[PDB]
Amino acid sequence: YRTRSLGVAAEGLPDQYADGEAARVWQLYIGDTRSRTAEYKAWLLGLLRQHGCQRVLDVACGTGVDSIMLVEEGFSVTSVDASDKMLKYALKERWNRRHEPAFDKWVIEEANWMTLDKDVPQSAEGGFDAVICLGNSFAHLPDCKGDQSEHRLALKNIASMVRAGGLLVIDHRNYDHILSTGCAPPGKNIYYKSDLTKDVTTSVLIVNNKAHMVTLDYTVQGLSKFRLSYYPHCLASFTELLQAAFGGKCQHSVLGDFKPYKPGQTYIPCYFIHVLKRT
Amino acid sequence: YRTRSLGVAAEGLPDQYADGEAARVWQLYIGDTRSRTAEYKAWLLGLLRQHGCQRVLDVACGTGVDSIMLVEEGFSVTSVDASDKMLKYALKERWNRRHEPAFDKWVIEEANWMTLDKDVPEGGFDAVICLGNSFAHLPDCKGDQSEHRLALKNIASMVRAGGLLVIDHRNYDHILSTGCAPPGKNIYYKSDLTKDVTTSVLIVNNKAHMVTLDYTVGLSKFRLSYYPHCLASFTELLQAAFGGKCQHSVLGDFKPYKPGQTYIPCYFIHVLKRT
Amino acid sequence: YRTRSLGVAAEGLPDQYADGEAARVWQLYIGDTRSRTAEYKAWLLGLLRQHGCQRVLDVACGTGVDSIMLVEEGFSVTSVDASDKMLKYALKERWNRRHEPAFDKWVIEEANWMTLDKDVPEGGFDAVICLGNSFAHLPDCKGDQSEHRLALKNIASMVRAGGLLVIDHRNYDHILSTGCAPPGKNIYYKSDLTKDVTTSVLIVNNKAHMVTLDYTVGLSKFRLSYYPHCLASFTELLQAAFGGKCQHSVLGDFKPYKPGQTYIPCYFIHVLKRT
Amino acid sequence: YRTRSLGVAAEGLPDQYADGEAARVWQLYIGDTRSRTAEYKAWLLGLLRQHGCQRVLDVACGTGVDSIMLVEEGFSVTSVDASDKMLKYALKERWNRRHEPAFDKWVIEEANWMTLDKDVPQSAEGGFDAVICLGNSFAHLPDCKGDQSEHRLALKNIASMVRAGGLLVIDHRNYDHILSTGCAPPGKNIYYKSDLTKDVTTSVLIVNNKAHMVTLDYTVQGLSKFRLSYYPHCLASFTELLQAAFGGKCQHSVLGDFKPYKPGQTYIPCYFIHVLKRT
């Protein structure tokens, strides 16, 4: 006997778990995007301009921080997420600078990976010049069914957002390394340096000999604790998933931490970033 | 072993229960308010202009529908709610008409009853409204009503000297005594959904303590709960909230209410003026 | 991600909730029955011997304390319950006096009301007893009381031609109307624990539907729930269970009950004889 | 709003989860102890008689099947478990043969590992001749705190049940092998052959690079599904845990599937069985 159904709000009532220890401390966590690194800004801006990108779809924009950078650099951006919880900060900022003309034109909407075609809006045009999905968000999507086919669908829908000749930019942490050291240490984000000091417990879940989940239990120092989970995408496999998603008719390369990656290199990157161009 | 903590979102992941069969029927319920009755609009507009109210605080604005009416009628409105999931529709609409000047000036923020002083953004508000039976959403978790006392004190303190509080509650005198909260009885917004409602009364230690409605409305279920505030007792809660320096009257369904009258109202609305 | 399914034990592991602060206070509650009142013993023994009952079925024997009395008094008793956790104490005691011949012959098995025919182990029982307000444990999950109908039919069918059913329920007429189930009022076993009880009444669609007692008794909490059976309605349930071929009378606290009497009883006991 | 507290029964009511899909199918599972293997009976009986054991403590007797064998072979047995759910079948059988004199003397009680000293009863004597904990039950005990110290305590208490000169017989599946193939296949129990046909999903949980849990999700064929978890005890470590438990004053050896085990041997045993004698 719950007093209200799961997932239903009520006027003057916080939504179900808004108020808990874990929530309060996770918000402190997605509120540390106050230092975009210089190397990241110069590489994303450089890639999108080498390719003549003007219209960009930011998938899983979260708080909207990559997107605000884009809007400020003159791109025509539409930014979507499934999480209303995160989208609220994006929408706030647009509203604050609602009065800068670049931000008037900023499009922000709700979308889900699984229905991404129906959810995203597409102008007197059709087809985005580049679609970005960065910060290791794709890995947030679990393989609930078991065979990865939700990953297949999600990547098909993202794929289909990319116009002919356009780019998909999409990253994951280096799960090869993680599975093999058994750790996902903190302080490694190459997009935004934190200055929070954190401990992390790393839990690796292997089902029937295939890694299936990586779960990180954070302690941040005011001592507090939250948990986030990821699907451990191995490099070789993800590349394939992406290839399948454009049906082979594409050009693919791999960066490790913004730089070209050649298998065997001695530098072990924190992140792998895939840039595909639709042919 | 949850895979993520309760209450923590993730890029490209629906928040925890956004997607359930209850949620997706409750957002049809939150969205069936497309017909503010003529009677209500003429009453609220009347009461606010009779008193010279200009700057208004809408507490628990939910989708912002009363507030949109106020913005359109030339009031200076700040509208708050605790629920981000309802506030999202208010924010959306402001954004869409962001281009009308009245809506540029519409202020919308998060606030919670228990910290209302710190949350809301000068020398008071002229009138503060809390209508649609929103106050009744607030449960008495502790047991002694000490959270309604605090909430009311915070709402109270939003009202400047000489200003108004308008605050309503469904007629729980009558519900408790028939054991039923029937649907179709909102005097503010006429639905055209047809619904069945199961009414559950929870009495703790001989005091009514909760009223829980299980709706059926494409057939499917959700549940909402309410604290059954009795008329005599609410009046007292409000009187305590201004410390007795106030004047109070009671409407039943927009009309003056005299105890004993034969017309049994669906809602009681208190209008208080701070002295 | 539970680590083991709900309801599956494991060598050298306490079953799921055996160890909680509620459990370990409820087993103090199940164990405070060390004083069967003189009045009760003289009544039940009297009623069973008046009627010539020899072979008796104790339904919902719990710790087996009424049954132990019967074994000691020379009856041929089979005692069943659904709960393994309460049945464990019955079984223990039989084992300890396994060496007295009366206890060798004591039959103790698991059974559930809903399949009672298949579960209990010839040509009927002489009397079937269901005392201590155990029947009221059975909730009306479906909504229409169709599970009490089935249960009663199964209990009924345990009673041979010319035999008795003795079955009681607390006075829920009176509880519903004061809104309180006070403690200290068991007429079968006097506690000397001191307890506070919060009484919660749940009324669905104007029918009382559940009574939930939150006990406080070294201070700590547990909760038990009950279906509030009203006297007039229970009588009918029982009449339907024998198909009308039966005779029925009502005691209030071991004494004849005439509607209107000034003595308001704690318990109603039905004694029915199959014809 | 639960209607009764977790863990409290009521007359004429099944206990909380007694009735579910999972329960109903797990009972089918511990009801397959109808074929003790010949090799096991001849080895346990032989070991206990080589050492002159007469008084035996069966820890985690579950349904009581090893114990009934012992009572029938003339041992003075006391059999304990924490699970009332399993103990119920042991108690049933004793009651049925209550009238055989060997079974009259059979002692059956509730005990928990963590309080095992206080819980078990000890005759006009003190100290059991041998204490057995077989069938991989010890592995049922989780490391909830994190540092294995519950294992330390539990093994101290079992240890302390063993009289001077007496034996502790205590086994675990071969978790070395399991962790390394990522599988715990079915059909491997060397004590009781099943004739149920089962599929198993094997899930390995590695926390901060130490294996922490092995969770088995069974499907049995009437198609039904239940889950059981285990702590993955590695051979080298368990031996140490046991050594620590007698404080070094003991004699230890290891069997693999009833036979002597020498590290490096080509036969990979399903189970490791430790026989320690207290000095």
Curated annotation (Swiss-Prot), chains A, D:
One of its GO terms (biological process) is protein homotetramerization. The modification Phosphoserine is found at residue 5. GO terms for molecular function: folic acid binding; glycine binding; glycine N-methyltransferase activity; identical protein binding; S-adenosyl-L-methionine binding. The modification Phosphotyrosine is found at residue 29. It is found in: Cytoplasm. Keywords: Acetylation, Cytoplasm, Disease variant, Folate-binding, Methyltransferase, Phosphoprotein, S-adenosyl-L-methionine, Transferase. Its main location: cytoplasm. Expressed only in liver, pancreas, and prostate. The keyword Transmembrane helix does not apply. Inhibited by 5-methyltetrahydrofolate monoglutamate and by 5-methyltetrahydrofolate pentaglutamate, inhibition is much more effective by the pentaglutamate form than by the monoglutamate form. Two molecules of 5-methyltetrahydrofolate are bound per tetramer. The binding sites are localized between subunits. Inhibitor binding may preclude movements of the polypeptide chain that are necessary for enzyme activity. S-adenosyl-L-methionine binds at residues 17, 26, 29, 36, 60, 81-83, 112-113, 134-137, 173, 218. Pfam families: Methyltransf_25 (PF13649). The modification N6-succinyllysine is found at residues 41, 188, 193, 198. It comes from the Eukaryota. Its EC number is 2.1.1.20. The keyword Coiled coil does not apply. It is an enzyme of class 2 (transferase). (6S)-5-methyl-5,6,7,8-tetrahydrofolate 1 binds at residues 1, 227. Homotetramer. Catalyzes the methylation of glycine by using S-adenosylmethionine (AdoMet) to form N-methylglycine (sarcosine) with the concomitant production of S-adenosylhomocysteine (AdoHcy), a reaction regulated by the binding of 5-methyltetrahydrofolate. Plays an important role in the regulation of methyl group metabolism by regulating the ratio between S-adenosyl-L-methionine and S-adenosyl-L-homocysteine. Belongs to the class I-like SAM-binding methyltransferase superfamily. Glycine N-methyltransferase family. This is Glycine N-methyltransferase. It comes from Homo sapiens. The lineage of its organism: Eukaryota, Metazoa, Chordata, Craniata, Vertebrata.
